[PDB]
Amino acid sequence: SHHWGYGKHNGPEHWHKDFPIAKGERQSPVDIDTHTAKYDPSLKPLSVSYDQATSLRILNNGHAFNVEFDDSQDKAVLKGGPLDGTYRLIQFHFHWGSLDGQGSEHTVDKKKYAAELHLVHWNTKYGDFGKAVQQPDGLAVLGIFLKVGSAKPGLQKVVDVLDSIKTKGKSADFTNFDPRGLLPESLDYWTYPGSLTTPPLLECVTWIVLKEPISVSSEQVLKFRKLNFNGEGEPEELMVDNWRPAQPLKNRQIKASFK
Ligand SMILES: CC(=O)/C(=C/c1cccs1)C(=O)Nc1ccc(S(N)(=O)=O)cc1
Ligand SMILES: [Cl-]
Ligand SMILES: [Zn+2]
């Protein structure tokens, strides 16, 4: 079994030894250079259809926390933009920092945000998530930057349950959560082909990164930083800086949905 994490001893600089694809041709995240991303008129409109989303549970997995959805039917889907066909929402999670000047995985002209939200979707033509991650177009991850300012009211139900999943392996019931409350006003985005940003680092993701960040309060992100990487009863290791740094772009072009 693997023992990867975000520390000096097991952090992103080490991952390549158990996961050689870490040094691959389409790794994530990347720096988005706004002055070399080109507007693409071929991109179709982005369609976020979360009206029927059914959240079930929230889990501390020792790396982040996942809010899990019922993906047994097309209840919450992402379509359009660069995507062919229908991608089903399975979970969302965040990456965040020890301080407000770091935490995001993607950067914008080398700017790091306080955190980044990932809404993870799988291509329904592959029938299940485990099959989809074996395909170069298997997943679509919608990435949203968080900056510290005004509170995000639609985030507070997540903040308030974190006390109940402090340590690795803890879960709580988390029904009737509406992920539409986490979106910014604008769906303007950048898109590029990439990877999972954690082991197993599979090159199966179409990244869609929204240009407009959402604002959350200092108090909201301080509550993320009280989570633990460790299990119950173990020495406390605060769950902070669970982000992978920007990886080489190599032979890829980032496309913008907007002028
Ligand atoms: C157990 C579990 O949670 C997962 C299992 C998998 C099993 C096989 C491939 S993944 C999973 O979904 N991993 C994941 C999802 C999104 C991102 S990211 N930061 O690129 O959005 C990173 C990791
Ligand atoms: Cl900004
Ligand atoms: Zn992620």
Residues designated catalytic: 63
200 lines ligand 1 (CB under 6 A): yes
Question: Three-state SS for 70?
Answer: coil
Read off the amino acid at residue 123.
N
Please identify, by atom number, the ligand 1 atom nearest to the C-alpha of residue 196: 20
Task: For Cα atoms 25, 208, 87, give the angle at the middle one, nearest 5 degrees.
Answer: 100
Closest CA to 188 of 255, 110, 113: 255
The ligand placed nearest to the CA atom of residue 112 is 2
Read off the amino acid at residue 129.
F
CB 255 within 8 A of CB 37: yes
Whether the bond into 200 is cis, omega within 30 of 0 = yes
**Resolution number, Å:** 1.5
133 lines ligand 1 (CB under 6 A): yes
Taking a 5 Å cut-off on Cβ, the residues next to ion ligand 3 are 118
Residue 95 assigned ligand-binding role: yes
Per-residue CA distances from 17 to 4, 101, 102, 159, 200 (Å)? 10, 29, 26, 35, 12
User: Could you tell me how far CA 9 lies from the centroid of its own chain?
Assistant: 24
Contacts of residue 119, Cβ cutoff 8 Å, sequence gap at least 6: 78, 89, 92, 141, 142, 144, 179, 182
Q: For 82-241, where are the alpha helices, taking DSSP H only?
A: 129-132, 156-161, 218-224
Please identify, by atom number, the ligand 1 atom nearest to the C-alpha of residue 197: 20
Residue 3 assigned ligand-binding role: no
d(CA 105, CA 95): 7
Considering its fold, how many domains does the chain have in total? 1
139 backbone φψ class: left, alpha, beta (φ>0; ψ -120 to 50): beta
CB 232 within 8 A of CB 65: no
- Cα of 7 to ligand 3 centre, how many Å? 17
The token duo for 77 is 């889907």
d(CA 68, CA 91): 4
d(CA 145, CA 188): 13
User: Could you tell me how far CA 155 lies from the centroid of its own chain?
Assistant: 15
Q: Range of 10's domain?
A: 1-259
149 lines ligand 1 (CB under 6 A): no
